[PDB]
Amino acid sequence: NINSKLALTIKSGKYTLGYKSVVKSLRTGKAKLVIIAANTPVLRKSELEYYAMLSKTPVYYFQGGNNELGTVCGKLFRVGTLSILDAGDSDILSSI
Amino acid sequence: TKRTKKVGITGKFGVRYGSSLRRQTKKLEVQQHAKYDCSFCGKRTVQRGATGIWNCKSCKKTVAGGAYTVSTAAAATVRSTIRRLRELAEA
Amino acid sequence: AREIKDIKEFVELARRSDIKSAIVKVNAKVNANGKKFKQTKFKVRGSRYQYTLVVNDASKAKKLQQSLPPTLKITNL
Amino acid sequence: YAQVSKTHKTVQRAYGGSRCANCVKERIVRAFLIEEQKIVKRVLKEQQDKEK
Amino acid sequence: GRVIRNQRKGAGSIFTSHTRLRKGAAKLRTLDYAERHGYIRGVVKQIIHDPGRGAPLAKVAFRDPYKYKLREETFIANEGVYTGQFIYAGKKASLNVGNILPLGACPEGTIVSNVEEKVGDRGALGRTSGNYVIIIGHNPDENKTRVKLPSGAKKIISSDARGVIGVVAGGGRIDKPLLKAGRAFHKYKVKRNSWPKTRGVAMNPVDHPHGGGNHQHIGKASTISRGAVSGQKAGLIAARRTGLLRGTQ
RNA sequence: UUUUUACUUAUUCAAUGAAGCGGAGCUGGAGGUCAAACUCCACGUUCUAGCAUUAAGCC
RNA sequence: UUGAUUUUUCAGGCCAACCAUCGAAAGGGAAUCCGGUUAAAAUUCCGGAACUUGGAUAUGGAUUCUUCACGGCAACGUAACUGAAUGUGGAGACGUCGGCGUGAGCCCUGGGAGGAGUUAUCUUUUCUUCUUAACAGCUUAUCACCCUGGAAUUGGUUUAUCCG
RNA sequence: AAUAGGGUGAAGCCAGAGGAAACUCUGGUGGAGGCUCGUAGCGGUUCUGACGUGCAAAUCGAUCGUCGAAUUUGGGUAUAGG
Numbered sequence: 013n014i015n016s017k018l019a020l021t022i023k024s025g026k027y028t029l030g031y032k033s034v035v036k037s038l039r040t041g042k043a044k045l046v047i048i049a050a051n052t053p054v055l056r057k058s059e060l061e062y063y064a065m066l067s068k069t070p071v072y073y074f075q076g077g078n079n080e081l082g083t084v085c086g087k088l089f090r091v092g093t094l095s096i097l098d099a100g101d102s103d104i105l106s107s108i
Numbered sequence: 109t110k111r112t113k114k115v116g117i118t119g120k121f122g123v124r125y126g127s128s129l130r131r132q133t134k135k136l137e138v139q140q141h142a143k144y145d146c147s148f149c150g151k152r153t154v155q156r157g158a159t160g161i162w163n164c165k166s167c168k169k170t171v172a173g174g175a176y177t178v179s180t181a182a183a184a185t186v187r188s189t190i191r192r193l194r195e196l197a198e199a
Numbered sequence: 200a201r202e203i204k205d206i207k208e209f210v211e212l213a214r215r216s217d218i219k220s221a222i223v224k225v226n227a228k229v230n231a232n233g234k235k236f237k238q239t240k241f242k243v244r245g246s247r248y249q250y251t252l253v254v255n256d257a258s259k260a261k262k263l264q265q266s267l268p269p270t271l272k273i274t275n276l
Numbered sequence: 277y278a279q280v281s282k283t284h285k286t287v288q289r290a291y292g293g294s295r296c297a298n299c300v301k302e303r304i305v306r307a308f309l310i311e312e313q314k315i316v317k318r319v320l321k322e323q324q325d326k327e328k
Numbered sequence: 329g330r331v332i333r334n335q336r337k338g339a340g341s342i343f344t345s346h347t348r349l350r351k352g353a354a355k356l357r358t359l360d361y362a363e364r365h366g367y368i369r370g371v372v373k374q375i376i377h378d379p380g381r382g383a384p385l386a387k388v389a390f391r392d393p394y395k396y397k398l399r400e401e402t403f404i405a406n407e408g409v410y411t412g413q414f415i416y417a418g419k420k421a422s423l424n425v426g427n428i429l430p431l432g433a434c435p436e437g438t439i440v441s442n443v444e445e446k447v448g449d450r451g452a453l454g455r456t457s458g459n460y461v462i463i464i465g466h467n468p469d470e471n472k473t474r475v476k477l478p479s480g481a482k483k484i485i486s487s488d489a490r491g492v493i494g495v496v497a498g499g500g501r502i503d504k505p506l507l508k509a510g511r512a513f514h515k516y517k518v519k520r521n522s523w524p525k526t527r528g529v530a531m532n533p534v535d536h537p538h539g540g541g542n543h544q545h546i547g548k549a550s551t552i553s554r555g556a557v558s559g560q561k562a563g564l565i566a567a568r569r570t571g572l573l574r575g576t577q
Numbered sequence: 578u579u580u581u582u583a584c585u586u587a588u589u590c591a592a593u594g595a596a597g598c599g600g601a602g603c604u605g606g607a608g609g610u611c612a613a614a615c616u617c618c619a620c621g622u623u624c625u626a627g628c629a630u631u632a633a634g635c636c
Numbered sequence: 637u638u639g640a641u642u643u644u645u646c647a648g649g650c651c652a653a654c655c656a657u658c659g660a661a662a663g664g665g666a667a668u669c670c671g672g673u674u675a676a677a678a679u680u681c682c683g684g685a686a687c688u689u690g691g692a693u694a695u696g697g698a699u700u701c702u703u704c705a706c707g708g709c710a711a712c713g714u715a716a717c718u719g720a721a722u723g724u725g726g727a728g729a730c731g732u733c734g735g736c737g738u739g740a741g742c743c744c745u746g747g748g749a750g751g752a753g754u755u756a757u758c759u760u761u762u763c764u765u766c767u768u769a770a771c772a773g774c775u776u777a778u779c780a781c782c783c784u785g786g787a788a789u790u791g792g793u794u795u796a797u798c799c800g
Numbered sequence: 801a802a803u804a805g806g807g808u809g810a811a812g813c814c815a816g817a818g819g820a821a822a823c824u825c826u827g828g829u830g831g832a833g834g835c836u837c838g839u840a841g842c843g844g845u846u847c848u849g850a851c852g853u854g855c856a857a858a859u860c861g862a863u864c865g866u867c868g869a870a871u872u873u874g875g876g877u878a879u880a881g882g
């Protein structure tokens with residue numbers, strides 16, 4: 013179900029794909045949600061959720077890997093993490 | 109074009125050793141020279157070193173595997189068996 | 200062998216207490232973008248290294264030569 | 277290496293001539309994050325040492 | 329006659345193992361206080377090829393409990409063990425692949441490898457590629473555990489004996505034909521001088537009990553008594569039966 | 578006299594740089610407590626390829 | 637290993653897993669080159685120019701009043717620019733084959749400055765000299781890495797299809 | 801430590817063509833193999849050649865086997881007369 017909600021956000025809302033973009037969006041306070049793939053290294057994972065703790069941002073743990081996280085977003089590449097800047101027509105922020 | 113009808117990788121052996129031995133070699137030798145998906149980084153960059161050793165070029169993770177495949181069927185069964193027995197002991 | 204570029208450094212080096220002798224070498228060169236000029240190489244022999252200063256100006260060479268310590272033995276080549 | 281100055285054999289950083297820049301960076305972040313979680317696991321343990 | 333090839337191996341002149349390239353003896357840690365009472369944690373640094381061995385070896389670094397020092401252990405790599413993995417060894421270690429646990433701490437059906445025959449011998453059973461030991465049951469009153477060995481034998485071991493959870497890596501090696509004499513040459517170039525083998529029936533009567541004759545033939549039963557002497561034990565020693573194995577055993 | 582199984586010190590096997598053995602006692606978790614606290618278990622380390630060495634503190 | 641003591645006595649502080657020894661003139665390994673020289677020696681002699689190791693040791697520079705230096709976002713830079721026990725690493729230190737790339741020496745070749753040969757005829761011709769060591773300084777690179785940025789209309793890219 | 805120069809052309813990869821799919825065809829690229837022709841090398845088939853009181857107590861000539869590996873080889877080292 014969250015895959016359908018996440019797909020709608022990519023179609024209508026705003027997002028950043030990739031570790032470097034996600035950290036920038038947490039620094040600027042522009043992140044509404046951080047989604048982390050299951051096979052992300054724990055050190056990178058435990059650092060992203062430390063940034064979210066400082067930034068007061070909820071974190072959603074995707075159940076698939078970065079191959080499955082990429083294809084949910086309609087991409088032909090791998091996405092290890094992403095941040096939702098603007099949930100648009102979707103209601104992913106109210107569900108997480 | 110298609111170069112060989114059926115020998116494939118065992119075409120390096122010519123006519124020697126017997127057809128049955130060459131087709132038995134072909135099955136396991138395609139597997140040992142294949143590229144596998146890394147369970148750590150997600151890329152298809154895992155190749156065999158020596159037997160039982162499978163390295164990923166990208167993330168430099170080495171995992172112990174089978175002689176000619178990254179995972180044998182027996183190891184996959186043990187992984188679930190160990191996982192199941194662990195749940196009961198830890199409730 | 201070390202080459203010296205600063206003329207001021209060379210005169211201070213030539214009065215070091217370990218300096219045995221000096222060599223003044225004259226080379227008849229040409230820059231190939233003009234005509235003949237007279238290059239002068241001042242070579243100071245220290246304990247470890249021979250120090251060379253190349254003076255392409257025929258007038259600065261003569262001024263430099265009389266600026267060396269009078270005690271140094273000088274060989275003209 | 278014995279007959280060369282120290283600047284040739286090291287880099288001005290922690291673990292300078294021993295570890296690369298990225299491996300030192302990963303050590304620092306790992307040390308900070310893991311030790312931060314050690315405090316979290318301690319205060320949480322004290323939360324279950326007074327109510328349960 | 330002459331001293332036969334069986335007997336020349338005991339002197340071990342040219343029949344010792346070629347051990348220059350070997351990467352150390354694969355053993356568990358010495359059983360110490362931490363493993364007897366709790367657990368100790370190490371990290372896998374390397375998974376390496378050991379010449380003459382089908383199973384890869386794992387280099388695992390532990391801390392010394394008593395002095396400031398790192399201890400590197402040479403374990404037999406179980407399949408699924410990776411570099412950077414944390415290995416836990418002791419009584420209180422959890423049931424995860426690669427962890428070293430006492431046999432009594434493992435439930436029935438646990439697949440375990442590099443199992444100790446005796447408490448503290450650092451691993452005897454199920455050490456080759458693809459092999460393992462199955463835990464059959466426990467006898468807590470006598471502090472004993474029943475296991476099944478790769479040969480199919482049932483064994484009773486102390487519950488304090490240790491083993492490594494999982495299957496030894498490198499399995500399936502025998503499935504591929506060698507296809508060449510050169511492959512066996514390279515196989516034994518780093519094991520010992522046992523290849524190639526001349527058939528005793530192809531020798532002269534000095535060389536072997538099977539040598540001689542105007543045709544190549546053994547001449548007498550090739551099943552030899554268990555009580556026969558050295559120089560006679562060539563053939564099927566103490567063979568309970570012979571011929572193609574038909575049906576179950 | 579014969580069979581079985583108890584002891585450990587002779588003898589035998591093994592390991593370690595002979596490091597934590599045996600018993601008891603402190604602390605919790607429990608039994609339902611029918612005197613009075615007896616019995617059992619545990620008694621500092623488990624998201625992460627970091628660190629831990631030459632005692633701080635109290636009397 | 638120090639602080640020593642001149643009291644030629646000591647005070648201690650650390651450790652002692654392993655560690656007799658022999659075993660390579662093709663393995664590992666501190667450091668030298670050029671020119672000349674003999675009847676016969678030369679990387680050994682002569683001339684010049686270097687280098688390493690061990691020891692002693694002064695001057696200059698550097699550093700300190702924010703005591704044990706500064707600069708760069710960073711990769712990292714530098715003339716230097718405390719660091720015991722103990723520990724962790726690196727170098728020593730490593731098969732084989734294939735094509736590709738770069739260099740060096742050699743081969744080939746143009747002009748010019750010399751010398752020799754042919755020349756009945758022809759041949760601006762045929763042959764030959766035109767070199768630069770170890771070492772010192774500056775500069776110079778595939779690979780790798782850093783900063784910026786955020787990529788599908790997927791792009792970059794090798795002889796060999798790998799990378800994001 | 802050593803091992804000319806060729807032939808063949810395995811995987812993998814690129815492009816094009818055909819097909820509903822499962823898939824097929826073509827042209828390149830690539831450079832596998834106890835592959836192959838053939839030097840050095842290692843060996844020793846035949847002439848039942850020479851020689852056969854020899855150049856030689858095993859050689860000489862032609863012819864031949866093999867020639868990138870179970871290859872060839874120096875030195876060090878181990879194994880000692882039932």
Ligand SMILES: [Mg+2]
Binds near residue numbers: 285
């Ligand atoms: Mg440096």
Ligand SMILES: [Mg+2]
Binds near residue numbers: 525
């Ligand atoms: Mg056989």
Ligand SMILES: [Mg+2]
Binds near residue numbers: 527
């Ligand atoms: Mg045989």
Ligand SMILES: [Mg+2]
Binds near residue numbers: 530531532
């Ligand atoms: Mg015979």
Ligand SMILES: [Mg+2]
Binds near residue numbers: 329534536537
């Ligand atoms: Mg006999």
Ligand SMILES: [Mg+2]
Binds near residue numbers: 537
């Ligand atoms: Mg017999």
Ligand SMILES: [Mg+2]
Binds near residue numbers: 537538539541545546
């Ligand atoms: Mg016979």
Ligand SMILES: [Mg+2]
Binds near residue numbers: 544
């Ligand atoms: Mg027969």
Ligand SMILES: [Mg+2]
Binds near residue numbers: 593595
């Ligand atoms: Mg002991």
Ligand SMILES: [Mg+2]
């Ligand atoms: Mg010696």
Ligand SMILES: [Mg+2]
Binds near residue numbers: 660
């Ligand atoms: Mg030597």
Ligand SMILES: [Mg+2]
Binds near residue numbers: 730
């Ligand atoms: Mg070597």
Ligand SMILES: [Mg+2]
């Ligand atoms: Mg040598």
Ligand SMILES: [Mg+2]
């Ligand atoms: Mg000379």
Ligand SMILES: [Mg+2]
């Ligand atoms: Mg001579």
Ligand SMILES: [Mg+2]
């Ligand atoms: Mg000399």
